[model samples]
Target: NIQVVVRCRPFNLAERKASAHSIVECDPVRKEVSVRTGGLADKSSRKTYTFDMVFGASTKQIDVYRSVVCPILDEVIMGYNCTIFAYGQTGTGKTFTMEGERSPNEEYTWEEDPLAGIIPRTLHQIFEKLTDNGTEFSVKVSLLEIYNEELFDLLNPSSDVSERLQMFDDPRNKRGVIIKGLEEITVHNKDEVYQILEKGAAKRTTAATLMNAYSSRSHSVFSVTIHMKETTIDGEELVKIGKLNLVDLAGSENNINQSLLTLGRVITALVERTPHVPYRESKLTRILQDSLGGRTRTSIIATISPASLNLEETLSTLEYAHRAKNILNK
Candidate 1:
C-alpha cells in the first residue's frame, strides 16, 4: 500500500520575519488536514483532505521516526521492499525532513543530533534492531542524486560531477534497473553510517555549486539493502533480501518542468491503472518504477509550511498526497 502522510513545518526565520499566520490545521487522530480557503472570520472557508497520517507543526523528528519509520523498517527486515519519500516546495522542509541539518549546539555528535531526520535515524536503527535480534545480516547503502535527466552517484567518491551513470535493465527483476558504476558501501555498524552519509552529503554539496543550481531542484535517493540468513529447526537456512529506498524530491513547483512533469504523468497512470504507463519518459520515473506501483510498499511524506504566505504550495502538497493514497502496490 502507498500510505500518504502530511507534515506542517514550524515557522522558520524568514517566515517569522514576515509574521505569516498559519492557515493549515492537521488533525492527526481524524487523519485530516484543513486549510483556510478565504479571509479571516469566514468559518466555512476551510477546505480539508484525509491521508494515512497527519503531523502538525508541533511534531518532532523523533516522533516521525517512532510513528512512521519504525514499522516500515520492521517490514523491510522481514524481506520486503519499501520506499518512503518527502515532497514539498523549496523552503517547506522537504530536505529537512529527509536529511536534517546539524543542531545549534556543538556538544552532540552528528548521529546523536536531536535534529537528525529520517535517513540518519533509519541508518541508526537498522544496525541497532538487526543486531539486537541476533540476525545474521549485512547492510549496504547507495546514494543517487537526480538532476533533470542525469543520475549522479553521491556515494561514489571518485564519481566526477562531469560523469553521469548509465542505467541498465535489471535482468533478474523487470521492474528494477541497475545503475552502472553506482557504489554500494557496506555498513558494519551504526557508527559507520555517519561517516558514509556525511561523505556523500559533502559530495552532494560540491555538485550543488557546479551547475549554478539549488539543491532543492534535485532529488536524492538513499537506498538501504539488507540480506539476512535465518536457520529453521530443520537446519535449513533461508535467506531474505529487502531494500528500503528513501527519496527527497525537488520542490512541488517543479511540476511545470523536467522530470516532475513525467512524474505527474506516471503517478496518474498508476492510479488509473493505465496499462502503458510511461516510466521511460524520465530518469526519475524509471528508477522509481518498482517503488511506485511494483512489489514494493511505499509511503510519501508531503512536507509543507504552516505559514499562510506559502498557502498555495501547502494546499498543493495536500492534494497530491491525498490523491497518491489511492495508488495500490503489489
Candidate 2:
C-alpha cells in the first residue's frame, strides 16, 4: 500500500506552505494557469496567465486539481491496482476530486456521457489503451461505506452490519465487505461500471449543514477490478487481474465548540489504530481498513485548507498522511 502518488492542496493565497502550493495567479483573458511546472516566478511572459492567481478569484487551486493529481493517474494507467485516498478535514475538495459531485451545491456534476474522478477517468484511458478485438475481458466493481467502525455496502441501501461472514472469493460471485471476502465484479464496458457507481452514490450518506452547504458525513470506498485473460498466450489461459481502488477515505474532523460531532468521530477511527479502531462504528471505515493499511497500491491525496484557523487540523492531517504513506503490501 505504498502511496505511489501523494498530492497536497494549497491555499488560495500564498500564506502557508500548504496554501503556497495552491496559490496560482491566473488571467481570465488568457484562460490557463500561470505556472505550469517547477514553480517559476511569473515574469509577465507572453503566456496570458502569470503565476496561479486572480486578484479576486481562486488561485493556485489548479495546481492541486490538474498538476499534481492528473499526472499520478497518467503514470499508473495500466498494470496492477492503483488506489487514491483523499485524507484531510471535511469541506475540502476531497470528495469533489475522488467521488463525483455530491449535491447541487457541490463543485461539479457526475456526467454520465464522460466519467469523473481519477478512477473513471483512468478507466477510460486504460480502455482506450487495451485492444481485444471483440475478445474483451471482465471488469467488476464494488462500493461501500465505513461509518464509525461498521461496514455498509454503498451499493445496497440496508448497510447496518458490523461484520459479515466471508462469502465471496471465487472471483465471480465471491464478494464480501471485508478485504478477505471482497467482491470482484466483471464489466466489459464503461456504462456498466458507471451504472453501478450511480447506484452506490445514491446510497452514499450526505447532508446539508448550516456551516457548509454540502458535506460528506461518512467515508466511502469505491473499487474497480479488471480481470484480464490472454486469449492466445501460448494457447494457455493466463488470467492476470488488474485492480483500481478509488478510496474517498473518511475525513478527520473535530467537535471543538460543537461544530460537527459526526465528522470528528469519523476522523478518530481513521487516524488512531485502536484495538477496536471503530471500524465497525461506521460503515465507511470498516470496508477500507485493508486498502488504507493493507495490501494494495495506494495513493494519498492529503488536502489542507489555507485558512489560519485550520492550522491544528492541517498539522494533524499531514501527520496522519505521513503514517498512512508507510503502508506497503508485503
Candidate 3:
C-alpha cells in the first residue's frame, strides 16, 4: 500500500519569538491527528483525521526514518521504483524534514543525532546494505527543480534557457517521463552522493518570503538511480534497476499559483479515476506521473504548521492528504 504520513514540525525560531501557539494535537497511539479552530476558551470548532502514521513535534528523525522510509528502502533493493514527497505550506519545515540541518563544520553526527533528515538517512542505509551484501551496483543521481512551470537542472545552473529539459515518451525504458540535458552524475559511494547533493542544494531556487526566511520557490527533486547485477541460486545472472525519487514540493499558499492548482487538479483526477489524468498540465505533475500512477511505490509526508495563524492552510493540507489517500495505483 502507498504510505501517507504527517509530521508536525517544532516551532521555528521566528515562530517561537512571535509566540505562535500550536493548535494541532496528535495521538500517536492511534495514528490520528486533531486540529482545533478556536482559542483556549472555546473548543467547538475541531476536526480529526486519520492517516497511515502521524508524528508530532517531539518525534525523533531516526524514529520517522525507521517507521516510514525504511520499508521503502527494503523494497527498492528488491527492484522497486520508490518515491517519497514532502508537501505543505511555506515555513512548515518541509525543507528541514527533507534535508537535515546544515552545519558549517561539515560533519554528519548520525550516532547521537536525531537532526538528520530522510535523504541523508536514506543514502546511509542504501550504501550500508549494499556493502553488507557485497553487491555489485552502480548509482547515478540527478537533481532538478520545477520553477514557474519550467524545469531546470540544479547541478548545471549555468546553462542557458535552451538547456531547459523537455519530457518525452520513453516507452522502451518504461519511464514515461525523461528530462533532456539534465546532468546525471555517477557516484561511487555514499560520501560522493552526499557531496553531489550538497552541490545541487547550493543551486536550488530559494527566496525570502514573508512567510519563510529561506523558502523554496521551486519543487526540487533529488533522484538516486541504482543498477545492481546479481546472481541467482539457479546460476542465473540478473540485472535490476531501481530508482528512489525524493521530491520537495513548493509550499501551498492562500494565493495559490497555477502550478499548485494543477497539482490539485491532478490529485482530483486520480481520486475520481477520471479518464484523463492530465499529467501534462504542469512540469511538476508531468514528472511525477510514473510515481503517482504507475508501478512505483510512493509515500507522502504532509507537513503542517500547528499555529492558529495558519489554520486555513493546515485544513487545506489535511484535506489534500485525505483526497490523496483515495488514489489507487493503476
Candidate 4:
C-alpha cells in the first residue's frame, strides 16, 4: 500500500511580503486540508480533501521522520522494496523535505542537525538499528539525477557528471532495472554515508550551475540496498535483501514538466487500470516503473505553500497527490 500525505510549508520572506493571510489550512487531527476558493462572502468557497496524513506549517522535520520514515524503514529492512518521494511546485519545499539544509551552526553536525531531512536521518537510523541485530549486513548507496530525460550518476567518484548512463530491464527481476554505468558505493558506517552524501551534493551543485533551474528541472533518485546474512538452525546460510528508494521529482507547477506529465499519466493509467502504463513515456517513470504500481511499497509527500498567491499550484499538487491514492501498488 502507498501512503499519501500532505505538508504545508511556512510562508517564506517573499510570500510574507504580501501578507500572512493564507488561503490554505491544514487540520492534522482530521487529516484534511481546506482551501478557500472565493472571497470571504462566498460561504461555500471552502474545498476540503483528506489524506493519509497532514502536517501543518508548524510541523518539524524530526516529527515527520518519526511519523513516516520509521515504519517504512522497518519494512525496508524486512526485505520489501520501498520508495518515498516528494512532489509539489519548485518552491514548495520539496527538496527541503527530502534533503534538508546543513546545521544552523557549527554546534551541531549535519548528522545531528534538527533540520536534517529524511535521507540523512534514515541512513543514521539504519546503522543504529542494524547495530543491535546479530545478523551481518552491508549497505550500498547510489545517487542519480535525471534531466532532459538523460541519466547522470552523482556517486561516480572517477566519472564526470557530463557522462550519461544507460538503463535496461533486469531480466532476472521483472520489477528491477540495471544501470550499466551506475556506481554503487558501499558504506561501513553512517559517517561514510554522510561524506558520500556530501560529495554527491557537491556534484549536484556543480550540475546546477550547468542549468538555471537545476533543482526544479531535475529529478533525483537515491537508493539504499541492504543485504543481511543469517544462518538457520540447520546451519544453512541465507542472504536477505531489501531496498529503499528516496526520490525528489521535478516541480509539478505545470503540464510543461515532461517527467511529471508522464507521472500524472502513469497515475491516471494505474487508477484506470489501463492495459499499458506508458512508463516508457518518460525517463523518470521508466526508472521508477516498479515503484509506481508494481510490487514495491511506496509513499508520497505532497508539499504545499501557505501563501494565497500560490493557491493554483498548491491545489494542483494536492489534487494530483490525492488522485494517486487510488493507485493500487502491490
Where model 2 places Cα greater than 4 Å from the true spot, the runs are 4-79, 100-115, 131-135, 157-186, 205-215, 232-236, 255-294
RMSD values for the candidates in order, in angstroms, are 1.9, 10.0, 3.3, 2.1
The number of clashing residue pairs in each candidate reads 0, 42, 0, 0
Per-residue lDDT for 25 in model 2? 34
For candidate 2, report its TM-score. Answer: 0.57
Q: Is candidate 2 or candidate 4 better by TM-score?
A: 4
Least well predicted 10-residue stretch by lDDT in candidate 2: 47-56
Model 1 lDDT, full chain set:
0.83
User: Of the candidates numbered 1 and 2, which has the greater lDDT value?
Assistant: 1
TM accuracy, model 4: 0.94
- Expressed as tens digits, the lDDT of each residue in 1-330 for candidate 4 is 678999888888876786567888899999999988774634648778999999998988998999999988998887888999899988888888898877654779867888888998988988888777555789998987888877989888797677889988789977567888989999898778778987987889888987668788889999999997755456655587899999999888761567778888999998988998888888888789888888889999999887777888888888988988988776
True-structure lDDT of candidate 2: 0.47
lDDT of each: 0.83, 0.47, 0.76, 0.85
- Cα shift from native, residue 296, model 2 (Å): 2.2
Pull out the clashing pairs in model 1.
none
Q: Please list the residue runs of candidate 4 whose C-alpha ends up more than 4 Å from where it truly belongs after superposition.
A: 41-44, 174-176, 231-238
Q: What does candidate 1's lDDT look like per residue over 6-75, in tens digits?
A: 9878877777898777788888899898888786845558889998888888888888889999998988
Return the TM-score for each candidate structure.
Answer: 0.94, 0.57, 0.88, 0.94
lDDT of 4 at 147: 83
Cα RMSD, model 4: 2.1
Query: Which number leads on lDDT?
Result: 4
